[PDB]
Scaffold this active site. Structure first.
Site, mmCIF file in Angstrom:
data_model
loop_
_atom_site.group_PDB
_atom_site.id
_atom_site.type_symbol
_atom_site.label_atom_id
_atom_site.label_comp_id
_atom_site.label_asym_id
_atom_site.label_seq_id
_atom_site.Cartn_x
_atom_site.Cartn_y
_atom_site.Cartn_z
ATOM 1 N N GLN B 11 0.802 -1.211 0.000
ATOM 2 C CA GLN B 11 0.000 0.000 0.000
ATOM 3 C C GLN B 11 0.839 1.266 0.000
ATOM 4 O O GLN B 11 0.347 2.311 -0.438
ATOM 5 N N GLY B 143 4.613 -4.413 6.710
ATOM 6 C CA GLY B 143 3.241 -4.729 6.394
ATOM 7 C C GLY B 143 3.061 -6.179 5.998
ATOM 8 O O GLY B 143 3.842 -7.046 6.361
ATOM 9 N N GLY B 144 1.991 -6.424 5.256
ATOM 10 C CA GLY B 144 1.565 -7.779 4.986
ATOM 11 C C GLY B 144 1.293 -8.082 3.531
ATOM 12 O O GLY B 144 1.099 -9.243 3.168
ATOM 13 N N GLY B 146 3.311 -5.942 1.316
ATOM 14 C CA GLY B 146 4.490 -5.355 0.728
ATOM 15 C C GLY B 146 5.709 -6.028 1.301
ATOM 16 O O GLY B 146 6.839 -5.763 0.899
ATOM 17 N N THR B 179 3.780 2.530 13.483
ATOM 18 C CA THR B 179 2.335 2.439 13.332
ATOM 19 C C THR B 179 1.808 1.030 13.586
ATOM 20 O O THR B 179 0.943 0.848 14.441
ATOM 21 N N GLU B 183 5.151 -4.986 13.152
ATOM 22 C CA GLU B 183 6.216 -4.815 12.170
ATOM 23 C C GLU B 183 7.615 -5.263 12.613
ATOM 24 O O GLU B 183 8.437 -5.496 11.714
ATOM 25 N N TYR B 224 1.571 12.488 4.299
ATOM 26 C CA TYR B 224 2.193 11.485 3.453
ATOM 27 C C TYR B 224 2.438 11.997 2.046
ATOM 28 O O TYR B 224 3.408 11.572 1.411
ATOM 29 N N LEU B 252 22.382 1.206 -15.550
ATOM 30 C CA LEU B 252 21.933 0.329 -14.477
ATOM 31 C C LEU B 252 22.725 -0.967 -14.395
ATOM 32 O O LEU B 252 22.641 -1.659 -13.380
ATOM 33 N N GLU B 254 26.014 -1.406 -14.035
ATOM 34 C CA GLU B 254 27.155 -1.317 -13.123
ATOM 35 C C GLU B 254 26.823 -0.794 -11.739
ATOM 36 O O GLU B 254 27.749 -0.501 -10.980
#
Lengths: 140, 438, 426, 68
Positions: B11, B143-144, B146, B179, B183, B224, B252, B254
């Site tokens: 999220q 989280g759960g 992510g 939060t 976690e 946020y 990207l 190296e």
């Protein structure tokens, strides 16, 4: 001159011209379409190649990198060591300005003669507002 | 024609990407409609949107991203908002139920259903890219969906595509502000299983950005939304050496040879130099020689960690905008004469530089000022070991009474891996004190 | 009539060598279209050395342009004089090397160099009498230092008896711009002592300070350092194209300057460097050019040449000058400080005087030095590879690619060979 | 333009000279610098157009009209 003021006043404002380079007088010459960008933030010119489908050319998007273009060089600048030094403000008598790009006129950059035949709606409005020029009709 | 997949799971990562993908459409000309303007020219070459957007002959430009979340309510506001006519309507993969701060609800039980609609877009997205280079994943540890669900992509995408670098950007849990109650549990589970497949997993924090926005930006009571456009500018300065031109282009391939010395020491952290409000950025000279030194503060780091407790290993100073390369070179030599910025003995070189020709961008209605230059350093320090000291001690109190456990073991997950995930993160922590021994 | 092949690999060699043709074509009178507009009739009569003439008069060059990452050959075609080359000569893949030595010489390099050497062969046949090879190496990593020796160890298998002319930017005592830099250096000097007849060193440190106290620039970018490199690069091949009074080609410059087989790494220079301010306050002759040539602050490689001697020094001369002025003022400089040369050979100066000055001057020169001080430039990479080695730092992107470890001590053992040879004859 | 040529044997450059053949070095070099600045015959094995409609006269007097 406040370079930051020019940048802030003209940020993202680009004059866009449609040009042809007619090289048909050359032994293998072709009439080719180009887009000329003039950046109002720093008075730089960029020349982009317009590729058609099946034109037989390598797909390179640029004819000329974005750089400030000299219109008239000082007579002594013929001996300037361009192989080691970049052209400074001391070797240039006149730089290309937004006034030099006119629809229906030839424009000579780096020994190539471009014919400007049209301009975008933003450029048309900018010329009307800044130079008081009447409508810049597209040339067929 | 060099391409990048941008997967946004969880999220947090679906919410950063709301503010990330408005910035790529802004750098180039593309409207939130997805079409390009008829009259105004932004100046763009011909293929500089080739990296993140797949132009289609209808005129629309279509982005390379997959926005999957099992709880439906956060992608349904992107499916209705300003950016509806941008995406592909098959990209936005909607689930049915929560993941609810549970690792095993997202990684094993509900995750076994939704995974084949996720992968059958990625293995379709790869077949239209002819110059594909890697992954840009956006998730969050605490989280759960992510945390559990990022290691359900990572242990399959590594299996199919093999050796291609994968660059996931994750919000690290903060020391004091937190939060979720669980976690400390689901942080360890997503790093025992993704440290074997990651190549460089960058770290962002919520507490550090809450303080540098309080002082440098001089905003107060922030949201946020004001954090997502500070994480959207780092990733648009990482991926500016694939869409623009310049003196030193660090692409990207190296980032594993510049930043990863030993194969499990790939946890680097990033800052960004000229974050000044619009009333103070015009009142001083912001040049190359001091924004390279404002990068080396304790108070300008996006992760709440003292850099001064450990020696750097390899930096990467990715410049931007109006920079000539002499000014970088006299400014790095300022750094190594200081006896506070401690580099370490087996790496005499350390620094790696890229320059470019496009200045920073500003979102309209933004919080940031218009600046010519931008520096985004990326450093692999050894100070992040004691950011993993606390989060093992948070695990070591709750496991010490078997607390909070049975919501995990019920949803198809063995208890036997709690003891060996914290056996693992000792063996990760034992490496940083081993490499510092000269 | 005596042509030389040019090759452009790596980032740092692509960009300097594309600033090489804007100095070459400036001397001969080719506008960026590619046709000929020049005044002097002495440019035309030996134009064939670097150029090929094409049906129509678009004088096309003789370089081959290989790199893996295609973003720079979309960036050197787009220059001021980019639009002259051969589009058949552009060779590329799509996967960049990533600063790895084993992505250039070993793994991806087994693909593309089978298609590099047959674009070389398509212009070796159109040369009447070849005598040499130019290559713009870039020792700063593994895109032009790895696969550069993949070409010259394959060309030297084909042509055993021809000149090699590699102009290679060398690592620096200051902070570098690549963290695996001592790794990739010592891999590529194990082969450059076996296949090249010189390797003209260049340092970015010295070219930030020639333009700091002599030329006195304000902001020297990368576009200005390349004129310093390309001027020496165009000064060494003047006796091949322009008429002269003592004419000295690239084999004439060989037996002078290499006494023993493995002492050929040299040091470049360029004489009449002035400020923009004090040009007309200064009068230049032969005895002022000699003092501008023989100081440590006019060398284009970051070593101090007062910690050693010179085995052989050569200074080619351009312009309208006399030769008692030239020769007696090289006799004073071997006499005034004779403890900075070698006693075991009496003479130390090769003299070559041409009759054509460059553009914008009346006389110029080019200084080439073979000192024993180059071991200091090799002492550092010998010293800062070892400390990056015994802890096996940064390493598995080589060994995980196709490297071994047995050649990481069979390259250091030859790095410390060249330090031993330069010092032993001192 | 007299004395616009080159001697036989000049190693050097002359443009437009790889592209001309058939005469020796000075005669070619003058070219390489100027460029740098009534009825048909019997038993002939070729075709007169119209040679289906001729009757009763001579090949001389019937192929005159082709050239006039």
């Amino acid at each position: 001159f406040d370079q930051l003021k020019q940048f802030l006043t003209f940020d993202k404002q680009v004059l866009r011209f449609y040009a042809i380079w007619d090289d048909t007088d050359s032994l293998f010459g072709e009439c080719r379409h180009y887009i000329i960008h003039y950046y109002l933030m720093d008075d730089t010119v960029e020349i982009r190649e317009v590729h058609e489908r099946n034109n037989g050319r390598d797909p390179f998007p640029l004819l000329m990198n974005r750089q400030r273009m000299p219109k008239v060089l000082v007579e002594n600048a013929k001996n300037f060591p361009k192989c080691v030094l970049e052209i400074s403000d001391q070797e240039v008598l006149e730089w290309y300005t937004a006034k030099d790009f006119i629809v229906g006129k030839p424009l000579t950059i780096l020994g190539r003669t471009f014919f400007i035949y049209d301009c975008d709606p933003f450029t048309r409005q900018f010329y009307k507002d800044k130079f008081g020029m009447p409508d810049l009709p597209p040339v067929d | 024609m060099r391409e990048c997949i941008s997967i946004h799971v969880g999220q947090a990562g679906v919410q950063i990407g709301n503010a990330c993908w408005e910035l790529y459409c802004l750098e180039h000309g593309i409207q939130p409609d997805g079409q390009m303007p008829s009259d105004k020219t932004i100046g763009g070459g011909d293929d500089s949107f080739n990296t993140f957007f797949s132009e289609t002959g209808a005129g629309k430009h279509v982005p390379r991203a997959v926005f999957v979340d099992l709880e439906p309510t956060v992608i349904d506001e992107v499916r209705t908002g300003t950016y509806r006519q941008l995406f592909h309507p098959e990209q936005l993969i909607t689930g049915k139920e929560d993941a609810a701060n549970n690792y095993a609800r997202g990684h094993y039980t509900i995750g076994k259903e939704i995974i084949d609609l996720v992968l059958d877009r990625i293995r379709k997205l790869a077949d239209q890219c002819t110059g594909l280079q890697g992954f840009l994943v956006f998730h969050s540890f605490g989280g759960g969906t992510g945390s559990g669900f990022t290691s359900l992509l990572m242990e399959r995408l590594s299996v199919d595509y093999g050796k291609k670098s994968k660059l996931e950007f994750s919000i690290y849990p903060a020391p004091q502000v937190s939060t979720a109650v669980v976690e400390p549990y689901n942080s360890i589970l997503t790093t025992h299983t993704t440290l074997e497949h990651s190549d460089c997993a960058f770290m962002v924090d919520n507490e550090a950005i809450y303080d540098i926005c309080r002082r440098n930006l001089d905003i107060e009571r922030p949201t946020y939304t004001n954090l997502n456009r500070l994480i959207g500018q780092i990733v648009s300065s990482i991926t500016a050496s694939l869409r623009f031109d310049g003196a030193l282009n660090v692409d990207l391939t190296e980032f594993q040879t510049n930043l990863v010395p030993y194969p499990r020491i790939h946890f680097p952290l990033a800052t960004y130099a000229p974050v000044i409000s619009a009333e103070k950025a015009y009142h001083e000279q912001l040049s190359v020689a001091e924004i390279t030194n404002a990068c080396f503060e304790p108070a300008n780091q996006m992760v709440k960690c003292d850099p001064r407790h450990g020696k750097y290993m390899a930096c990467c100073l990715l410049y931007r905008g109006d920079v000539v390369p002499k000014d970088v070179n006299a400014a790095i030599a300022t750094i190594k004469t200081k006896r506070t910025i401690q580099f370490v003995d087996w790496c005499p070189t350390g620094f790696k530089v890229g320059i470019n020709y496009q200045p920073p961008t500003v979102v309209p209605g933004g919080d940031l000022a218009k600046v010519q230059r931008a520096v985004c350093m990326l450093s692999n320090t050894t100070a992040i070991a004691e950011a993993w000291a606390r989060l093992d001690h948070k695990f070591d109190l709750m496991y010490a009474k078997r607390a909070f456990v049975h919501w995990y073991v019920g949803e198809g997950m063995e208890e036997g891996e709690f003891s060996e995930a914290r056996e693992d993160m000792a063996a990760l922590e034992k490496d940083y004190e081993e490499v510092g021994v000269d | 009539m005596r042509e030389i092949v040019h090759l452009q690999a790596g980032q740092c060699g692509n960009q300097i060598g594309a600033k090489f043709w804007e100095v070459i074509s400036d001397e001969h009178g080719i506008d960026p279209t590619g046709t000929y507009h020049g005044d002097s009739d002495l440019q035309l009569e030996r134009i064939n050395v670097y150029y090929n003439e094409a049906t129509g008069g678009k004088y096309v060059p003789r370089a081959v342009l290989v790199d893996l990452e295609p973003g720079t050959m979309d960036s050197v075609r787009s220059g001021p004089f980019g639009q002259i080359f051969r589009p058949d000569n552009f060779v590329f893949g799509q996967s960049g090397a990533g600063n790895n030595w084993a992505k250039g010489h070993y793994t991806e390099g087994a693909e593309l160099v089978d298609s590099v050497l047959d674009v070389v062969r398509k212009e070796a046949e159109s040369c009447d009498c070849l005598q040499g090879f130019q290559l713009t190496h870039s020792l700063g990593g593994g895109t032009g230092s790895g696969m550069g020796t993949l070409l010259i160890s394959k060309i030297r298998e084909e042509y055993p008896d021809r000149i090699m002319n590699t102009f290679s930017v060398v690592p620096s005592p200051k902070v570098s711009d690549t963290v695996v830099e001592p790794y990739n250096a010592t891999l590529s000097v194990h082969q450059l002592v076996e296949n090249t007849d010189e390797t003209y060193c260049i340092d970015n440190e010295a070219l930030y300070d020639i333009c700091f106290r002599t030329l006195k620039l304000t902001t020297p970018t990368y576009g200005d350092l390349n004129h310093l490199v390309s001027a020496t690069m165009s000064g060494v091949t003047t006796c091949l194209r322009f008429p002269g009074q003592l004419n000295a080609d690239l084999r004439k410059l060989a037996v002078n300057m290499v006494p023993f087989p493995r002492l050929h790494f040299f040091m470049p220079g360029f004489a009449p460097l002035t400020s923009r301010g004090s040009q007309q306050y200064r009068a230049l002759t032969v005895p002022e050019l000699t003092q501008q040539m023989f100081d440590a602050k006019n060398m284009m490689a970051a070593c101090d040449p007062r910690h050693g001697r010179y085995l052989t020094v050569a200074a080619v001369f351009r312009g309208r000058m006399s030769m008692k002025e030239v020769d007696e003022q090289m006799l004073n400089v071997q006499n005034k400080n004779s403890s900075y040369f070698v006693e075991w050979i009496p003479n130390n100066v090769k003299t070559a005087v041409c009759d054509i000055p460059p553009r914008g001057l009346k006389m110029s020169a080019t200084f080439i030095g073979n000192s024993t001080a180059i071991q200091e430039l090799f002492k550092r990479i010998s010293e800062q590879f070892t400390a990056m080695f015994r802890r096996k730092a940064f390493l598995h992107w080589y060994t995980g690619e196709g490297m071994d470890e047995m050649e990481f001590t069979e390259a250091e053992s030859n790095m410390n060979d060249l330090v031993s040879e330069y010092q032993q004859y001192q | 333009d007299p004395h616009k040529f080159f001697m036989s044997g000049f190693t050097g450059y002359v443009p437009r000279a790889r592209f001309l053949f058939g005469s020796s070095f000075p005669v070619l070099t003058n070219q390489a610098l100027q460029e740098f600045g009534l009825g048909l015959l019997p038993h002939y094995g070729g075709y007169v157009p119209g040679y289906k409609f001729q009757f009763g006269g001579t090949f001389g007097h019937l192929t005159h009209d082709a050239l006039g």
